[PDB]
Symmetry: C4
Subunit: 199 residues, 4 copies
């Protein structure tokens, strides 16, 4: 529900920051590699956040980049992996270092991670690979999370994304968009013709 926080860094107790937005100071759990980039205390920060709601607790996970947030969101989906593991994962190695490891099948590095033996280690590199690359090694090539989250147009990605939010199966979503063939239209325009055609 909370997607981003923008306020003054009041305090730093890794892995958590205390950012004041208005008069309310929120606690944000951030991966060490991200934390290293937080501006000095007293400075204003902007951090994308993944909000977690439990029956007994509700925490905030933050990242400096949307891509970073996305990778983390995909990581948590992975079986056996939750907020804590992903956090540890992104403290030992950076979003890049991870991409790299999964596309270079550097299991070793992943295993030595606290709480992550061969089993999940492999799971990661497996469930994660496919998604990557479109990235072509760089985690910041354009529309990186569309890539992760959904190489064809940026707007087509976005549209396939949305169609899948609406219930269409991914095959369906893709085929549905391309049938339209218009990489140079607004992602909303595609989402719109596509729909109009589906029904």
């Amino acid at each position: 529900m909370i997607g981003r926080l923008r306020g003054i860094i009041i305090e730093k107790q890794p892995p958590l920051v205390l950012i004041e937005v208005g008069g309310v100071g929120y606690e944000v759990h951030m991966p060490m590699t991200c934390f290293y980039e937080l501006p000095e205390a007293g400075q204003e920060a902007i951090v994308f956040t993944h909000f977690v709601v439990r029956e007994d607790a509700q925490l905030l996970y933050g990242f400096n980049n949307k891509q970073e947030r996305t990778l983390f969101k995909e990581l948590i989906k992975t079986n056996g992996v939750g907020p804590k593991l992903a956090l540890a994962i992104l403290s030992g190695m950076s979003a890049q270092q991870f991409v790299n490891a999964v596309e270079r099948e550097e299991v070793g590095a992943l295993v030595k991670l606290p709480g992550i033996g061969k089993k999940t280690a492999e799971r990661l590199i497996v469930e994660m690979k496919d998604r990557f690359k479109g990235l072509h090694g760089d985690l910041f090539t354009p529309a990186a999370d569309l890539v992760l989250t959904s190489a064809t147009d940026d707007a087509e990605q976005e549209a396939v994304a949305a169609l899948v939010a609406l219930g269409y199966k991914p095959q369906e979503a893709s085929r549905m968009v391309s049938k339209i063939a218009r990489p140079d239209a607004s992602s909303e325009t595609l989402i719109r013709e596509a729909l109009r055609a589906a029904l």
Copy 2:
């Protein structure tokens, strides 16, 4: 609890917008037909919202118009239908297009919707019809949600609404208000004489 959000559109990833209110950026899930009307990023937006609270998650559903929110709230009440379906429903066709379909029994269109076969399709048009019309085809004739939500006075509608919030049965609420016969009094005044008479 949250009934409206007013802030700067920070980002757009259909179907969700990221609106910053103060320093907090809220994620809002909006039907594609609504989304199409959102001002450019950077602009200020005002979106009525339906807040959903689960044990494991709490999301925000937004609409450009109160009527739009109301229709959605009625849709979710419908059996087999929840936030996601209604969202899809209002992405394939607009509040109007829906009204139209239910009052013209255009099942076809509804069936082709992702996740909505004949069964719920019919349920919709059935449970929804009665409520409509007072609307007389237009979704924006005056006090449209009173119509949906509760053709006699605007204040009588509102009052019957409230009386039903308090526990009176709808028959009761209606008869109770009209007994007062004063379409030209404040909805609060009716709610007030009515009560005074009931007790």
Copy 3:
């Protein structure tokens, strides 16, 4: 957790108001007798609130006066009575009218209330009486909620209140404070000597 809301009245749909605080518009459920006192839309309002948190939902109940909030909080404690009943209760009759009815055992009036037959009706007047009066008929004589919530000093009341928040039994709390005999000290000072003596 939320104890008060202060913002601009954006809209009125009895029994709920939509007050904007900053950029966030909160929905507040208020008893009709209270609602009648809300300033015009567009004006700024201040409303004490009772926050309700469920597994499937979290609403806000508001009152113009702390006393009004207190009475409602005591009402909800009453067995068989919850937010909705109390709301109805305070829509049919005012905090005064209620006090009056309980201290004049006007069951009749209470029974005719929607959802409140003889059974709870009596329960009310029973569980509520004792608490009242110190009030001496007026709901706004000084420190009315201390009265309800905890005729001796205002500070002694407050202190007995706190001691009971800490685990002391009410008998204990009272006797403990008076032993101190100092109606003219700060409620905090009493809470402080009292404690110091208990341990």
Copy 4:
């Protein structure tokens, strides 16, 4: 999630304060010894908070000092002890008085506490001792909560803290940091070499 509140003290009803931050007034439950230090009403206050989320309720616990918050957080961990007991505990005696009692095994004082007989009394002094002292009697010697929460460097403490947040066992965390031997580096730098070495 909420780690601090900064606003205007709107009202005082010990043990709870009503602080307005922006337009929202939050209720904060504070131990009497802390409460005694709150500035006059109308003044601005800053209070560290421990946010509690239940299925049926979500309250805010506040303290004037981070150390005070930390002690309370450790207290709640203690078996048989929860927010209420700790609150009572810190109403009868101050963070100091407590430290003192645990390091001087003043069971007596603890027993007389409402709800705290010999059983938990001992538990406290037992589970709490070890943690203390590094404190050397004073609760405000530098990095007191690192002490409580994690006498070697401030940055090493912090780093061991973080490593333990990530899943490393405390033995592991400690040994891991010292192996680095660099009390004069940033806690982040340690967390960083340490990790780099672990993997």
